[PDB]
From a paper:
WD40 proteins are a subfamily of propeller proteins with no intrinsic enzymatic activity, but their stable, modular architecture and versatile surface have allowed evolution to adapt them to many vital roles. By computationally reverse-engineering the duplication, fusion and diversification events in the evolutionary history of a WD40 protein, a perfectly symmetrical homologue called Tako8 was made. A different computational approach was employed to redesign Tako8 to create Ika8, a fourfold-symmetrical protein in which neighbouring blades carry compensating charges. Tako and Ika are the first successfully designed eight-bladed WD40-repeat proteins for which structures have been confirmed crystallographically.
Numbering used by the authors: 2 to 319
The structure:
């Protein structure tokens, strides 16, 4: 249960992290994107990247979509780093990326949401979306669910361009959300969690949460993992709001979360990285992973990839 490989990382803070198969894609605040080999620890290449801070990364199959602070959205081949198609991108900072099938949905800090076709790069839908910075973006089955810094949550159907239903949203900035079937679940920075009906719009469940000022959220099935500034990492049920397991959490602000099967990984602002099993509540591992705030976590098949504010990228084994 140690590190699998040693990666050099970046010369500036890690701001985006993606992990697929045995390849890690990392973006830094200086615009640099690096492609790593998890099996050999060597970097595949230095991507020419963006001239601005990489803000989001999407890595699916062999195609990675990267957005930056200058509004560019690039689609390129993981094997060569070569641009596959040119997207016009947004005029404001890219703040959210979603990637499903051959469609890319990008959110911006001005509230705009654009829908691209990675086959032609043509702009499919370019709506104003929100009057606030888009903070969350989930896209599945030609349905886009977006959240914003003002607490608004919207549901669009790609192609039609209009909204399917209207949701009351939250009184606080959206931190994460998810959706499937009849249910849209969203979480705001004030700890509230709201479960919506994708066709009715009714607030089916409205919980105030068990923390004040949550920083990270994660949804897997009907279970929420919430990290807060006071260091508390909590696991509770979407249906009733009852807590499902007691974890001690960190003594520093939670800045990153990861959730896969029965294992929750949390990063804190002091660099510590703890790993629990959600069933037994037992701390599988705790480590001072980085000397700086953990800013991104990726977890696939008992492998934890972590990014930090000093630019270090590390690969852990469960």
């Amino acid at each position: 249960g140690q590190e699998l490989v040693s990666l050099e990382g970046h010369q500036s803070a890690i701001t985006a992290l993606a992990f697929s198969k045995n390849i890690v894609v990392s973006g830094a605040a200086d615009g640099t994107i690096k492609v790593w080999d998890i099996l050999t620890g060597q970097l595949l290449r230095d991507h020419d990247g963006h001239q601005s801070e990489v803000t989001a990364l999407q890595f699916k199959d062999n195609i990675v979509v990267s957005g930056a602070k200058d509004g560019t959205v690039k689609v390129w081949y993981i094997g060569t780093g070569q641009e596959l198609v040119s997207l016009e991108g947004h005029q404001s900072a890219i703040t959210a990326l979603a990637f499903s099938k051959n469609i890319v949905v990008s959110g911006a800090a001005d509230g705009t949401i654009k829908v691209w076709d990675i086959l032609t790069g043509q702009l499919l839908r370019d709506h104003d979306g929100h009057q606030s910075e888009v903070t969350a973006l989930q896209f599945k089955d030609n349905i886009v669910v977006s959240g914003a810094k003002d607490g608004t949550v919207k549901v669009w159907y790609i192609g039609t361009g209009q909204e399917l239903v209207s949701l009351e949203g939250h009184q606080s900035a959206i931190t994460a959300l998810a959706f499937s079937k009849n249910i849209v679940v969203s979480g705001a920075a004030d700890g509230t969690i709201k479960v919506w009906d994708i066709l009715t719009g009714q607030l089916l469940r409205d919980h105030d949460g068990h923390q004040s000022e949550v920083t990270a959220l994660q949804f897997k099935d009907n279970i929420v993992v919430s990290g807060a500034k006071d260091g508390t990492v909590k696991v509770w049920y979407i249906g009733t709001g009852q807590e499902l397991v007691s974890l001690e959490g960190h003594q520093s602000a939670i800045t990153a979360l990861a959730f896969s099967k029965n294992i929750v990984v949390s990063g804190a602002a002091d660099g510590t990285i703890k790993v629990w099993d959600i069933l037994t509540g037992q701390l599988l591992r705790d480590h001072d992973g980085h000397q700086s705030e953990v800013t991104a976590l990726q977890f696939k098949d008992n492998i934890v990839v972590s990014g930090a504010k000093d630019g270090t990228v590390k690969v852990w084994y469960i």
